[PDB]
Amino acid sequence: ATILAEQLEAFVDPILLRPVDDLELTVRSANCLKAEAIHYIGDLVQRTEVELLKTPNLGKKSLTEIKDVLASRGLSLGMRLENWPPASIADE
Amino acid sequence: VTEVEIDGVLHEYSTKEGVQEDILEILLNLKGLAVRVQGKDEVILTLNKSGIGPVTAADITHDGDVEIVKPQHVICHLTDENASISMRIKVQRGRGYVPASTRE
């Protein structure tokens, strides 16, 4: 093996991060939140439900759809973010 | 090459309206494609061609590192005025012979 080697050394939250339109509900339930220039459900969780109920852009059926979405407790739980990002949501 | 996705083709045993070879023969002609890649593991090449005549291997929209070494290679023959193929080709590195039955 020494001879043959020397013969070769000259070669070698996921619901909040998802969009409102990605929700299982209809497009109207997403558009009710999207009328306030919201694209992510994290923006919906950043605002209170009372603040959304004080705007007539949401409808009566949209309130029931929002309740059905909040029944899973992933969104609209009355939270407050920095702007968008949590610590797990970090830039890398 | 590993994967091909012709646009209007469900399974490889079908036929596309306006090309005088089957989809299986197009897969053999793409299997014989001689291509160099430079700085990637795998790469996706794009092919678009419309009009009467051959679809040579030089009709692939080449990326910034993929280099075809034989551009006269025929794949198939389009045979009508408005009948066009549009496929995505997946070309990757490897070693030996890796068939389809082992590894969509």
């Binding site: - | 469900l10 399974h11 490889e12 045993y13 079908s14």
Partner: protein, 100 residues
């Protein structure tokens, strides 16, 4: 009652009908393995008589005149393939489903 050719059947898994459409028949082009489901088919079971514990199930679910087992067609154990062509023939009078 008759048999149900629809996908709506029990004892399944995401691996039980992840290649079937919304009406039981496998797609044209779905490359299957040995032992998947091509056509989902459920048949009737026992009749006997209406039990005391099943007296409420006698008529409270539309099509509750039949039971439900499992007799779906499967690829015989050993062969792969790619489904290239599906034929559906219907005896006249029977409701055509959405894929027919």
């Amino acid at each position: 009652g008759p048999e149900e050719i629809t996908a709506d059947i029990p004892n399944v898994g995401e691996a039980a009908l992840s290649k079937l459409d919304e009406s039981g028949i496998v797609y044209i082009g779905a490359e299957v393995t040995g032992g998947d489901i091509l056509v989902g088919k459920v048949t009737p079971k026992g009749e006997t008589q209406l039990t005391p514990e099943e007296k409420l199930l006698r008529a409270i679910f539309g099509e509750k005149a039949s039971d439900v087992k499992d007799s779906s067609l499967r690829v015989p154990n050993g062969v792969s393939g790619t489904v290239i062509d599906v034929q559906v023939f219907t005896r006249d009078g029977v409701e055509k489903d959405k894929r027919a």
